[PDB]
Amino acid sequence: NLKPFERDIYFPLQSYGFQPTNGV
Amino acid sequence: SSANNCTFEYVSQPFLMDLEGKQGNFKNLREFVFKNIDGYFKIYSKHTP
């Protein structure tokens, strides 16, 4: 699906649980 | 029917050059070339009576 500046109008969906505890 | 939100809004002069007052001797022959390449919509236009 890659295109020049792909406009995101096989595509998995997930979320990052960023927390301050992480140090890496 | 509806337009929730417009990411891109643009206002300018009209895409019209001789749309009014044309003489009856000659008639409009308006052309346009609409293309969508590299994320750019391009409108190559010319007017020839």
Side-chain angles (χ1 to χ4, degrees), chain A residues 5-23:
Chain A
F5 313 105
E6 169 55 16
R7 303 269 58 262
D8 184 359
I9 315 309
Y10 186 91
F11 304 95
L13 285 66
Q14 288 300 339
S15 63
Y16 277 138
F18 300 111
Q19 294 183 359
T21 302
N22 306 334

Side-chain angles (χ1 to χ4, degrees), chain B residues 16-34:
Chain B
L16 311 177
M17 189 190 68
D18 51 2
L19 279 285
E20 303 174 2
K22 179 62 180 301
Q23 284 65 352
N25 297 89
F26 303 144
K27 299 294 295 187
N28 184 328
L29 193 67
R30 192 170 68 170
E31 293 98 337
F32 284 87
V33 189
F34 304 97

Side-chain angles (χ1 to χ4, degrees), chain B:
Chain B
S1 187
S2 56
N4 303 269
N5 294 319
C6 304
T7 64
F8 181 81
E9 286 272 346
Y10 175 84
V11 301
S12 172
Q13 286 295 297
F15 297 165
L16 311 177
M17 189 190 68
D18 51 2
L19 279 285
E20 303 174 2
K22 179 62 180 301
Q23 284 65 352
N25 297 89
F26 303 144
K27 299 294 295 187
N28 184 328
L29 193 67
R30 192 170 68 170
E31 293 98 337
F32 284 87
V33 189
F34 304 97
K35 56 162 60 176
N36 174 272
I37 301 297
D38 305 335
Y40 284 82
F41 183 77
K42 313 187 184 61
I43 308 175
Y44 303 81
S45 180
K46 190 72 178 190
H47 304 55
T48 59

